[PDB]
Every structure is written in C-alpha cells, then in structure tokens.
Amino acid sequence: YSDVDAILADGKQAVAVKHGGGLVVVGELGAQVLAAKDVSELPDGV
Amino acid sequence: AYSDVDAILADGKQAVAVKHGGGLVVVGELGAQVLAAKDVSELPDGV
Amino acid sequence: YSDVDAILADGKQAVAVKHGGGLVVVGELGAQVLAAKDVSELPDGV
Amino acid sequence: TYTKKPGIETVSYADPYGEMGLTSIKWYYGSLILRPEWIALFKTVAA
Amino acid sequence: TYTKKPGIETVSYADPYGEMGLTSIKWYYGSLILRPEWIALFKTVAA
C-alpha cells in the first residue's frame, strides 16, 4: 500500500504502534487468527 | 460474541485499542504466538 | 524477551494495549497473516 | 507545528513513564498553471 | 512520580470516556564503590 487512505479504502484496518514505533495493518482474516484460544478457533482457512 | 468489554478480559483474551478505522481488536494468546514469529519455525504447533 | 530493546534489536515490533494489561509484539511473519482478507494472501508457510 | 515535550504531558497507557517526545509539521499546498503557454523550459546537457 | 487522574486529561482515542488512570515511579542506579578493599564479606551456612 502507498498511503493510509488506501488501508481503509480496501477495508483493511490499521493500528498504531507506539512502544517500538511503526504502523501495522490488520485484515479481516488476520482478526480471526488473532482471536484464537486454541487450535479450534482459528478460521477454516488456517 | 463478547457482549461487553469485561467478557474479553474475564475470558482472558486481550483487547488492543484500534486507530483509524474500526473500533477494537481482540487478542488471543495463540494469535499473539502467531503474531510473534520471525520464521516458519517459530509459528505455533497449529500452523 | 527480557527487556524492551531486545524486541527492537531482534527486529520485532511491539504495540501498546489499552483494554487489559499486556504488550503484544508483532513480527514480520505476523504482519502478512494479520493483513489478510481471505485465504489467498498469507505467507506460504501458512 | 505541534510539540509534545517529554514528561507529564506525554503520559499515557502507551508510555506510563512518559519518556517519548514528539514534534510534527503539517501544511497544505496547491498550484494552478493559468497560462502554461507562458511557462517555458529548455533542456540541455552539462559539462 | 507521574500521576494522571481518570478524567478529560486522559481520554485519547483509546478511551474516549476517560475511565482509566496511571501512575509511574522512575529512579536511577548508584553504588560507586570508592574503596572495595574496605568492604569485607564472610560466608557461612545456617542451621
């Protein structure tokens, strides 16, 4: 991606990194893999 | 499915504040392990 | 990881967390999996 | 120009100890060539 | 000591309701041992 507007235009979400420095972009499928207690609650793709 | 913020904390999942779009993202410790990986060796047992 | 600089030295990036205590660390592999719309775009190791 | 000098003012959940500093500059720019026929340009190679 | 009472001073995007409050304590190290020879130590085993 080029500019932060392209993040939201795509539908991807972007979060702010403060402790180290930077900016990481979170996608929908990334959200599911992020919220997983064990092997069962990852999305079907993974 | 978590109705209130306390539900995420009570269940043990972490919740990262979200900038720009969206409102919030919920962190699972497996997701954190997946998040914290430099090489395909460091991925958890699942993936 | 003992101290914060070890995260930065290793190339890891660390975000700050509001709702609940913690400091989630992000890796380069952690990046693209997070930025995923669907099953198409994840690293081949996934 | 804004400046968030390190100390109490930069105290938050991200840096509870409040050690980071910040300074940003923002501005708006635009231009319109009313008469491009008046703008002239010659190209050449130098020594 | 840095203290931020929960209110308008600590709203940000993260907590647009200002329900949180932090505290910090920062110090530094010391112990420049001027004359190590004067300092003497003995070790033993207890009962």
Give short descriptive properties of this protein.
part of a larger assembly; 5 chains; A: 46 residues; two-stranded antiparallel sheet; D: 47 residues; mainly beta; 0% helix
Please provide a brief summary of the model.
The PDB classes it as virus. With 46 residues, chain A is α+β, with helices and mostly antiparallel strands.
SSE layout:
This is part of a larger assembly, with three copies of chain A and two copies of chain D (47 residues).
Chain A (H helix, E strand, L loop, with lengths): L3 H7 L2 E5 L4 E5 L1 H7 L12
Antiparallel strand pairs in A: 1-2
Chain D lengths: L1 E3 L17 E3 L23
Antiparallel strand pairs in D: 1-2
PDB class: virus
Keywords: B2, virus
Entry title: Shigella flexneri bacteriophage B2 Icosahedral Reconstruction
Question: Can you describe what's shown?
Answer:
The structure is cut from a larger assembly and holds 3 copies of chain A and 2 copies of chain D (47 residues). Chain A is an alpha+beta fold and 46 residues long. Chain A has helices at residues 4-10, 28-34; strands spanning 13-17, 22-26. Chain A has a two-stranded antiparallel ribbon. In chain A, a hairpin with a 4-residue loop joins strand 1 and strand 2 (22-26). Chain D contains no helices and 2 strands. Chain D has a two-stranded antiparallel ribbon with strand order 1-2. Chains in contact: A-B, A-C, B-C, C-D, D-E. Chains A and C meet through strand 1, strand 2 and helix 2 of A and helix 1, strand 1 and helix 2 of C. The PDB classes it as virus. The entry lists the keywords B2, virus. Shigella flexneri bacteriophage B2 Icosahedral Reconstruction.
